[PDB]
Write an enzyme that holds these catalytic residues in place. Structure first.
Site, PDB file in Angstrom:
ATOM      1  N   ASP A 102      14.265  10.695   1.295  1.00 54.70           N
ATOM      2  CA  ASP A 102      13.634   9.643   2.141  1.00 54.70           C
ATOM      3  C   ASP A 102      14.325   8.253   2.100  1.00 54.70           C
ATOM      4  O   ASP A 102      13.648   7.192   1.944  1.00 54.70           O
ATOM      5  CB  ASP A 102      12.130   9.511   1.857  1.00 54.70           C
ATOM      6  CG  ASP A 102      11.335   8.848   3.109  1.00 54.70           C
ATOM      7  OD1 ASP A 102      11.790   8.806   4.287  1.00 54.70           O
ATOM      8  OD2 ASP A 102      10.254   8.340   2.898  1.00 54.70           O
ATOM      9  N   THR A 143       0.878   5.949  -0.609  1.00 57.76           N
ATOM     10  CA  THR A 143       0.288   7.267  -0.453  1.00 57.76           C
ATOM     11  C   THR A 143      -0.989   7.488  -1.282  1.00 57.76           C
ATOM     12  O   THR A 143      -2.105   7.354  -0.772  1.00 57.76           O
ATOM     13  CB  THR A 143       1.348   8.341  -0.776  1.00 57.76           C
ATOM     14  OG1 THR A 143       2.227   7.848  -1.804  1.00 57.76           O
ATOM     15  CG2 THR A 143       2.161   8.645   0.473  1.00 57.76           C
ATOM     16  N   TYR A 144      -0.818   7.833  -2.557  1.00 58.42           N
ATOM     17  CA  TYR A 144      -1.951   8.084  -3.446  1.00 58.42           C
ATOM     18  C   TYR A 144      -2.242   6.849  -4.288  1.00 58.42           C
ATOM     19  O   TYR A 144      -3.301   6.747  -4.909  1.00 58.42           O
ATOM     20  CB  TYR A 144      -1.675   9.272  -4.387  1.00 58.42           C
ATOM     21  CG  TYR A 144      -1.333  10.604  -3.725  1.00 58.42           C
ATOM     22  CD1 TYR A 144      -0.064  10.833  -3.199  1.00 58.42           C
ATOM     23  CD2 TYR A 144      -2.268  11.641  -3.655  1.00 58.42           C
ATOM     24  CE1 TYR A 144       0.262  12.046  -2.607  1.00 58.42           C
ATOM     25  CE2 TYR A 144      -1.947  12.860  -3.063  1.00 58.42           C
ATOM     26  CZ  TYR A 144      -0.676  13.053  -2.542  1.00 58.42           C
ATOM     27  OH  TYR A 144      -0.325  14.243  -1.951  1.00 58.42           O
ATOM     28  N   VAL A 171      -1.842   2.349  -5.012  1.00 55.70           N
ATOM     29  CA  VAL A 171      -1.669   0.984  -4.511  1.00 55.70           C
ATOM     30  C   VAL A 171      -0.972   0.123  -5.591  1.00 55.70           C
ATOM     31  O   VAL A 171      -1.080   0.424  -6.785  1.00 55.70           O
ATOM     32  CB  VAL A 171      -3.015   0.378  -4.029  1.00 55.70           C
ATOM     33  CG1 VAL A 171      -4.098   0.532  -5.101  1.00 55.70           C
ATOM     34  CG2 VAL A 171      -2.833  -1.070  -3.607  1.00 55.70           C
ATOM     35  N   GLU A 177       0.830  -1.200   0.000  1.00 53.86           N
ATOM     36  CA  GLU A 177       0.000   0.000   0.000  1.00 53.86           C
ATOM     37  C   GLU A 177       0.861   1.245   0.000  1.00 53.86           C
ATOM     38  O   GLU A 177       2.030   1.212   0.378  1.00 53.86           O
ATOM     39  CB  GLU A 177      -0.962   0.014   1.195  1.00 53.86           C
ATOM     40  CG  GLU A 177      -0.285  -0.027   2.571  1.00 53.86           C
ATOM     41  CD  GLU A 177      -0.054  -1.443   3.103  1.00 53.86           C
ATOM     42  OE1 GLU A 177      -0.021  -2.398   2.295  1.00 53.86           O
ATOM     43  OE2 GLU A 177       0.088  -1.601   4.339  1.00 53.86           O
TER      44      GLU A 177
END
Ligand code: T3E
Lengths: 257, 299
Positions: free
Chosen positions: B129, B16-17, B19, B14
């Protein structure tokens, strides 16, 4: 410093790949250089009201010139192309961009929210998602590192002349961003201090005063006639103390080349 | 009908915006990962994180950076198509609980991660990140950087950018103290925290809050002063009441490492970002004099 030379080399390669077509306006049926000057002056106003960065404005202008190199557009839709390009540039570059309802409101409700979002999608398709383009602004901040010593007045005046070149497609579509930045930096330095294009930037860029001469003679005339131009929003902005009031300085009568 | 040539196989995870599923191309045989973005629920058009991720990844082709293969724009959806890799580094460390990770494999993974990051920085991109969940491995011995949804294009010299970026356990001290400017050195601090974790198999600095995270870094490296880091007592969130801890012996921070290994980790964790090592210079360190490419035991 560590990556400064790698990055300058890579941007000189990408400015040739992101360049618009020099003769496009002659092939547009319904729009003119004058109508484009009117649109660009209005975008300068929008950036001041929402307090946006100078870089956001330079990016939106590159997107517009590339789209009109391959798509015919009627005079009643030119403003819808420009509103969509300033929305995309804000999403790319800003920490907090304005909401879609604010872009619908500044057009005085000439267009609906549904029309603005369908135009966003069509611009992305025509440019094939290729949005990280080099600007006049990105070359100027690298050249500022060669001053001895740094001068706040020289910096603000060079940004002001680079911005005036966005307004007039004849003649500025024929020159690259790295070349227009070279002419603006030498003109600002000479006006304020009497000094010239330094030897350390000949070694970095390979450009001389002789190679810069044609763009320089054009930009000198633009600066001398600025008070009489039909479009005046850039001179009003640069009266502010944020830019040291540079638009009130007098231009040099002659350059001696 | 533009996804006609793909057959779905199983769900992967899964996001953020979007899948993510594993799928198969029915004409060529190629296995891929597919990320889906719904636009129906989007009252603001195409999201700013998707616009940055696609424009930047199209410019970055390199063997240690995951490949974007295609973008499909049908209906109320946008589909992104990526090359498929078998597992993440966080899952692989958990499965190595009993044996541990052998040193020649650790040295080969670090050398490869440094090649991919130097390529990003030479083309004016910050990742912001880096963590074991976003690093992916295959069955032939390769490792690759992934997930560019928090990335950005920078300028020379930088201006002020978004604050408080990077997952907390991997976050540099100049971001925690509120500094006006940050750059390429924040991605090198995250990779140094990751080198230590592959060797000990637990996180180096696991804090629960911003002040808890800062006090854990000070007890291991010493509380910084004006000699170690010029300008530090003038930063926005510095305080004169901070406790004053002594610096400790590096042989005690990661006990299994040799002399060349300790030298490299201490240069990646320097307090002053001007003196912290670059990805390009680290490739020539004597830690790497006998590097090879081992395959891993997967299943
Ligand atoms: C973490 N963000 C990611 N975005 C994409 C598209 C990823 C990806 N994942 C795989 N396969 C995979 C295999 C094992 C475990 C997992 S995980 N970390 O549980 O979601 C993923 N392959 C390619 C990509 C890409 N790009 S990861």
């Amino acid at each position: 410093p560590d990556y400064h030379e790698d990055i300058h080399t890579y941007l000189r390669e990408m400015e040739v790949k992101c360049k618009p077509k020099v003769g496009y306006m002659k092939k547009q049926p319904d729009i003119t250089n004058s109508m484009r000057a009117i649109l660009v002056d209005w975008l300068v106003e929008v950036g001041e009201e929402y307090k946006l960065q100078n870089e956001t404005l330079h990016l939106a202008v590159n997107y517009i010139d590339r789209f009109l190199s391959s798509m015919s557009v009627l005079r009643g839709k030119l403003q819808l192309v420009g509103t969509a390009a300033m929305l995309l540039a804000s999403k790319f570059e800003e920490i907090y961009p304005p909401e879609v309802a604010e872009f619908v409101y500044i057009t005085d409700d000439t267009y609906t929210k549904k029309q603005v979002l369908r135009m966003e999608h069509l611009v992305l398709k025509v440019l094939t998602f290729d949005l990280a383009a080099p600007t006049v602004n990105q070359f100027l901040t690298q050249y500022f590192l060669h001053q001895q010593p740094a001068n706040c007045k020289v910096e603000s005046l060079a940004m002001f002349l680079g911005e005036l070149s966005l307004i007039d497609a004849d003649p500025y579509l024929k020159y690259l961003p790295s070349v227009i930045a070279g002419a603006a930096f030498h003109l600002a330095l000479y006006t304020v201090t009497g000094q010239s294009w330094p030897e350390s930037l000949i070694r970095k860029t390979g450009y001389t005063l002789e190679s810069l001469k044609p763009c320089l003679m054009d930009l000198h005339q633009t600066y001398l006639k600025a008070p009489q131009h039909a479009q005046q929003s850039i001179r009003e902005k640069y009266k502010n103390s944020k830019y040291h009031g540079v638009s009130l300085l007098n231009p040099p009568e002659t350059l001696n080349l | 009908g533009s996804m006609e040539n793909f057959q779905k196989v199983e769900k992967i995870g899964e996001g953020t915006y979007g899948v993510v599923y594993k799928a198969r191309n029915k004409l060529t045989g190629e296995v891929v990962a597919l990320k889906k973005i719904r636009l129906d629920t989007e009252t603001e058009g195409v999201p700013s994180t998707a616009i940055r991720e696609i424009s930047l990844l199209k410019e970055l082709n390199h063997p240690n950076i995951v490949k974007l293969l295609d973008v499909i724009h049908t209906e109320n959806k946008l589909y992104l198509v990526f090359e498929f890799l078998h597992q993440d580094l966080k899952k692989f460390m958990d499965a190595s609980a009993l044996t541990g990770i052998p040193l020649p494999l650790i040295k080969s993974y670090l050398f490869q991660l440094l090649q991919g990051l130097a390529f990003c920085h030479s083309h004016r991109v910050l990742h912001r990140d880096l963590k074991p969940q976003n690093l992916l491995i295959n069955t032939e011995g390769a490792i690759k950087l992934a997930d560019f949804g928090l990335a950005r294009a920078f300028g020379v010299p930088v201006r002020t950018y978004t604050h408080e970026v990077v997952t907390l356990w991997y976050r540099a001290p100049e971001i925690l103290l509120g500094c006006k400017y940050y750059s390429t050195a924040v991605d090198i601090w995250s990779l140094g925290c990751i080198f230590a974790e592959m060797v000990t198999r637990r996180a180096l600095f696991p804090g629960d809050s911003e002040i808890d995270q800062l006090f854990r870094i000070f007890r291991t490296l010493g509380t910084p002063d004006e000699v170690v880091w010029p300008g530090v007592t003038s930063m926005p969130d510095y305080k004169p009441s901070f406790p004053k801890w002594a610096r400790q012996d590096f042989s005690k921070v990661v006990p299994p490492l040799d002399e060349d290994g300790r030298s490299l980790l201490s240069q990646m964790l320097h307090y002053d970002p001007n003196k912290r090592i670059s990805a390009k210079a680290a490739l020539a360190h004597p830690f790497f004099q006998d590097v090879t490419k081992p395959v891993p035991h997967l299943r």
